[PDB]
């Protein structure tokens, strides 16, 4: 028994497949896995102590400080996650072999439920694993002193004095990821932008 239930938006895999118990083991592993990662502070989704509201406050500050901004969003993010790349990223930090083994088994089970298309939206593990997946991407743009960068799930905005969207698109391609070309916004200083549903104005 499992049709569908719109959750945040749509999807076309996972459903009342996930209903409890298996949720507990996934929720327990998620809490265990949070102790292995400190994601860069420019990432605001699925992390205790952070929220979309924080990203909006930072965006409203950063927009006054750069000549350009680029707002974009990853297309079909969770279905697009490469499992082999995700498991290589996990093993670099989860050096507890028993915990890594349990995580790997569940990820492979979740991927099968997703019909081998990335991670299912109904698994409690998928959100934190999406942050693992983009951690090196996030740090690459975070640690650049000449730009600012904010991400909430698949939604990103970059503030810079030189346009970098070609580099963004390429770094995403290294992860198997693409932008939703329809929702991409470039702006010059003085322009407003919609980010996470909020209009952010210069000054
Ligand atoms: Mg998207
Ligand atoms: Na930066």
Author numbering: 1 to 203
Paper text:
A highly divergent group of RTs, predominantly related to group II intron RTs (GIIiRT), are genetically associated with a subset of Type III CRISPR-Cas operons and reportedly play roles in spacer acquisition from RNA. Here we identify that CRISPR associated RTs (CARTs) directly prime DNA synthesis on both RNA and DNA. We demonstrate that RT-dependent priming is utilized by some CRISPR-Cas complexes to synthesise new spacers and integrate these into CRISPR arrays.
